Design a protein around this ligand. Structure first.
Ligand SMILES: OC[C@H]1O[C@@H](O)[C@H](O)[C@@H](O)[C@@H]1O
Ligand SMILES: OC[C@H]1O[C@@H](O)[C@H](O)[C@@H](O)[C@@H]1O
Ligand SMILES: [Ca+2]
Ligand SMILES: [Ca+2]
Ligand SMILES: [Mn+2]
Ligand SMILES: [Mn+2]
Lengths: 228, 228
């Protein structure tokens, strides 16, 4: 048995258990991924690698993470590009920015990326996003074109509580986003972790801007995993 | 609030959430610090830095750690040097070996060392060890000359269960050691953690051999800290 857990309900300016990439940094008790500026990327990784699956027994870890995040766009009508929670190899670095959200590089399935991300996409990219042009929650597996998505109305400036759980027995990854004014969205899909990501991974957040922009922030974060 | 927990009941050939130094490695499901050879040092740290106290609030964290260890001396009469569980600055590296247990450099107090350790000393070093020449458990603070100690009879090759707990309210550090055949030892003292170590630290194990030697292995390890 191997387990990993942490809880940070307030971020300090010298948060040494996180690995920052791009414009990502801590300030005023909040983790800032990107400011409201064009063409940036911000990423934050928890320092310790997680044992997501066991090569020897073939076991896969059960896990759940919770975080509260806020998106502040100066113009409630022009918002881009989004925020994501992602599971990737330990040595992971920012990928394509803008619509790619700093985690992927193509709309085509690329097994070499070995990355699963749960996106909060705020800008319609015609080449791969849902035709309805709605902002949405989506589950990505080695591609920026989600395997499943769910419309979501962004409440500019409001904090959203997100819970992402993965059940090892069913291979179901569930996502839930709740706003206080009480509006909730849920989305599920079967992800076969053991065949997408390496057995040791790093988890983090990622947010990007492009021609359109907004400030992406995390105010608290917990994670708990258990590999038997 | 900031909490960090982890539990490993079986070590893997590639235990990526641990940082090894000296001859420390994992094999046969155990963490091996030193083999039964002369003059070696082996350390293992948890990859993620821990927030042990906070300057702006003045708050210090409560923590507990449980581990099982084994010392195998080829000859129960000639055994050295010892094993330690320690808290030190994030960038910590192996220090002087032999009777300095890979954690300190002298028997004189040295503030820049910023290291608190709990030793399981199996060799009598005339210049600083307790005059009775007894194997002992000690609480070291910025010096290899323990602040407090307690005689301990080594049970060669046997599994020892240890619990080291720090109570932030009273600043009391307590250590307990138990052998199957049920022999127990306990020691405690008040350590002002906030005055000795930095805000962020890394925790781990250390073991060393010198002219006299023995194998030091850890069989399981859990840790939990909570800073309000
Ligand atoms: O910011 C909105 C959009 O800006 C464009 O300039 C980027 O090429 C595109 O990837 C992004 O989605
Ligand atoms: O191994 C037992 C002893 O061996 C000596 O050679 C080392 O100098 C000393 O530090 C150590 O305590
Ligand atoms: Ca998009
Ligand atoms: Ca000694
Ligand atoms: Mn999308
Ligand atoms: Mn001693």
């Amino acid at each position: 048995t191997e387990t990993t857990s942490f809880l940070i309900t307030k971020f300090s300016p010298d948060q040494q258990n996180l690995i920052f990439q791009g414009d990502g940094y801590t300030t005023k008790e909040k983790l800032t991924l990107t400011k409201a500026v064009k063409n940036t990327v911000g990423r934050a990784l928890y320092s310790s690698p997680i044992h997501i699956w066991d090569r020897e027994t073939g076991n896969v870890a059960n896990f759940v993470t919770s975080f509260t995040f806020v998106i502040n766009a100066p113009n409630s009508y022009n918002v881009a590009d989004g925020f994501t929670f992602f599971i990737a190899p330990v040595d992971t670095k920012p990928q394509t920015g803008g619509g790619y959200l700093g985690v992927f590089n193509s709309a085509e399935y690329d097994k070499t990326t070995q990355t699963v991300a749960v996106e909060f996409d705020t800008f319609y990219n015609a080449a791969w996003d849902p035709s309805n042009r709605d902002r949405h929650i989506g589950i990505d597996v080695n591609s920026i074109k989600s395997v499943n998505t769910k419309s979501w109305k962004l409440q500019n400036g409001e904090e959203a509580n997100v819970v992402i759980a993965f059940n090892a027995a069913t291979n179901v990854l569930t996502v839930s986003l709740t706003y206080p004014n009480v509006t909730s969205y849920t989305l599920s899909d079967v992800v076969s972790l053991k065949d997408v990501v390496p057995e040791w991974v790093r988890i983090g957040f990622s947010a990007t801007t492009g021609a359109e922009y907004a400030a992406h922030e995390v105010l608290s974060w917990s994670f708990h995993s258990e590999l038997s």
